[PDB]
Swiss-Prot record, chain A:
Pfam families for the chain: Aldedh (PF00171)
SUPFAM superfamilies per the UniProt record, alphabetical: ALDH-like (SSF53720)
The protein's name: Gamma-glutamyl phosphate reductase
Biological function: Catalyzes the NADPH-dependent reduction of L-glutamate 5-phosphate into L-glutamate 5-semialdehyde and phosphate. The product spontaneously undergoes cyclization to form 1-pyrroline-5-carboxylate.
UniProt-recorded Gene Ontology molecular function terms: glutamate-5-semialdehyde dehydrogenase activity; identical protein binding; NADP binding
Alphabetical list of HAMAP family matching this protein: ProA
Family classification: Belongs to the gamma-glutamyl phosphate reductase family.
Subcellular location: Cytoplasm
Gene: proA
Catalytic activity: L-glutamate 5-semialdehyde + phosphate + NADP(+) = L-glutamyl 5-phosphate + NADPH + H(+)
């Protein structure tokens, strides 16, 4: 795989000097060619879907790994959308004249070669390819074993487009082979790859030597204060849970203040049965919600630290804001945390004392997305504290360097 | 070390919840105490320098270890200047209003617990402690073998100041034992320290990166190349080179390879040989420049292959003749450590191309490579020079020790 890495390095060197207009024309060209050769992609997708169905995968997984012609049309659409974004490469961050007559400035530059790992997601292939092409970063894709044929066809089409536009063919590469030893090798190219996006986390945590920007699992907690409007809080909770539960930013643990719980829990159950989410409630929550129409069961200790990714929820009663903060600190994964309240001091304390990647006040937790934050598109959501945090846009894939201009200046 | 880490975390929470006035008070008291207790620090440093010289320490190494009253006043002034800096905690990076009506913004926050493993140097401890206190982080320091008594005195003074100010005693901690097993255990303890800063040579960096479970901002070694173009002033280039090399050769931002164009090599090489002979710099010249530098007064010797990829840390320089700007760029890319690179030229196009095509942490045009320092770059003080690409790069100031957090405010806003 050394040859592939050296090809990616050369491609990054060539791409770092490109112009914004050339990148936009390239993006439009690849979108056009993807639209043109839709039938070839669809045939491979149908074959892969038939193979997966023969393997016994569920209907939901089969739909997820499938691709309709409408889906590829949408892929062309968001590629064209990223074509219209603002290029952050070369932009000046800050600068000034020093005391010794030296003019300093900081300039944004491409991060180099980016290796991303995913599984059973066909659209993310084209999405990450376009996003790295816009920034001028050579990308190495880890296509899933399930959809190897579709990913191979897509990367072949993109490479054909790049050759048509004259760009080096090594800008975008993919490893179709599903061998785990190759995965370890990719996890152990420090000198070549400069940054890794794992979209599984434990494996790279143990083995990786390249700096890793993790995505991580997300258990988002919502705290309900004693003074709040019942109907609006219920609507916010329903939007946070009912709409697309499979997303990693959905709420999982709901914290209800002790004082308001007596009134909140009955209406919560009344709306909850209509929404139809199972309530893994605590002991006191069980006692209060037993009369409720919504189905409710006891909660186990390990359920608080794991995301259901389904129509399930956890109900816990806390004494006050300090108890909720302690619980969030102990069990939270630092992904998203929101508070519904009508007190200014409580909101200020919650904002100051919580160290999540995104804190909301009287808002849903479903806004932790690249599109909602106005970043155009995102590659992943980072829960670490280094480099980018939260949704990662274009500027998250660029580093900076210092440039100093003088006239034979010497330090004194 | 588990109790050390838990104390660090407990102190870090309160430090992140503190205000700017208290941190400024702590820093001012630290500076005043350091000025008051100069005699003990000076005596300890003198004893340590004498002991190290008794073990045949290098002159540059001794100079790095040596601390004068002027240097103590300088570190006190640096502490005060850091105290005068604006607090980067709570500052807003950007914000706006979304379509859905969600007022969004980004705010700076402390990183948490910071571990640092530095070389044998007395001032780096004070600067690291001051920066971590100003930023609201808790710091665990592991010093070198030589700086034992000076580091003990400095950490005692800092802890006394923290106790006097009423801040939690776990904010700043240091490990006295020079055993490397403790270093390995610090490396393996992840859930407690949030970021590790190693300062040293290749061996330490390799050791941590082999057994690291924490994010690491490598200090890295410095091989700084200076490229001389065809059209350039000989005297000014010689002065810049002399300033880059002669002044403090023990640093990590000192030029180690001199790239000379063929066209200018006819005239630049002789005069250079005269200049370095004044400074006693030994010239490790390539085969092409060996004939030209043979008649020069300065001592000249052939250069081995591995010399291009290692730091001399002495009064030595590598002289190589390159064909053009592209050859120099290729050589810098192949053998450079991405620390600092400078070009001396009188052509605009060459300077622009060199700035564009060189992906180093610092690029200079008609300037020395000795400017790659936290103080010179306008920052109050530096914790380390980062040669990596993730998070901070180049000198690391106050903003390099902070992360950010998104905050959104709305009136029960719902995503559609
Ligand atoms: N990048 C920067 O910002 C920066 C700044 C200053 C200096 N430097 C670099 O500093 C280097 C010279 O430093 P130095 O003279 O102190 O020598 P060094 O060998 O680079 O120092 C290594 C440091 O780590 C410790 N160490 C060494 N081997 C270790 C091991 N196997 N496991 C754990 N710890 C280990 C050393 O103390 P023990 O030997 O007692 O373990 C010392 O504190 C230069 O190459 C220069 O580039 C870089």
């Amino acid at each position: 795989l050394e040859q592939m890495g050296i090809a990616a390095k050369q491609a990054s060197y060539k791409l770092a000097q490109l112009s914004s207009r050339e990148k936009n024309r390239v993006l439009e060209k690849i979108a056009d060619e993807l639209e043109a050769q839709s039938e070839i992609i669809l045939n491979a997708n149908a074959q892969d879907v038939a193979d997966a169905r023969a393997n016994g995968l569920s209907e939901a997984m089969l739909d997820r790994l499938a691709l309709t012609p409408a889906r590829l049309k949408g892929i062309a659409d968001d590629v064209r959308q990223v074509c219209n974004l603002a290029d952050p490469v070369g932009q000046v961050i800050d600068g000034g004249v020093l005391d010794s007559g030296l003019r300093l400035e900081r300039r944004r530059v491409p991060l180099g070669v980016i290796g991303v790992i995913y599984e059973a997601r066909p659209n993310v292939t084209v999405d990450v390819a376009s996003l790295c092409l816009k920034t001028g970063n050579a990308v190495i894709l880890r296509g899933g074993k399930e959809t190897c044929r579709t990913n191979a066809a897509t990367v072949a089409v993109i490479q054909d487009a790049l050759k048509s536009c004259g760009l080096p063919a090594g800008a975008v590469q993919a490893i179709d082979n599903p061998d785990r030893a190759l995965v370890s090798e990719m996890l152990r190219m420090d000198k070549y790859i400069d940054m890794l996006i794992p979209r599984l986390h434990k494996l790279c945590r143990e083995q990786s030597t390249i700096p890793v920007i993790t995505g991580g699992i997300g258990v988002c907690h919502i705290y309900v204060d004693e003074s709040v409007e019942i109907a609006e809080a219920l609507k916010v909770i329903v939007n946070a849970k009912t709409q697309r539960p499979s997303t990693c930013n959905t709420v999982e643990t709901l914290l209800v203040n002790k004082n308001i719980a007596d009134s909140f829990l009955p209406a919560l159950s009344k709306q909850m049965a209509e929404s139809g989410v199972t309530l893994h409630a605590d002991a006191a929550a069980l006692a209060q919600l037993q009369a409720g129409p919504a189905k409710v069961v006891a909660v186990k200790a390990e359920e608080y630290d794991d995301e259901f990714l389904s129509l399930d929820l956890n109900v816990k009663i806390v004494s006050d804001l300090d108890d909720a903060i302690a619980h969030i600190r102990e069990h939270g994964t630092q992904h998203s945390d929101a508070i519904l309240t009508r007190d200014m001091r409580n909101a200020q304390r919650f904002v100051n004392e919580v160290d999540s990647s995104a804190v909301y006040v009287n808002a849903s937790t479903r806004f932790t997305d690249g599109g909602q934050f106005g970043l155009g598109a995102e590659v992943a959501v980072s829960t670490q504290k280094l480099h980018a945090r939260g949704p990662m846009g274009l500027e998250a894939l660029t580093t900076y360097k210092w440039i100093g201009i003088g006239d034979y200046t010497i330090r004194a």
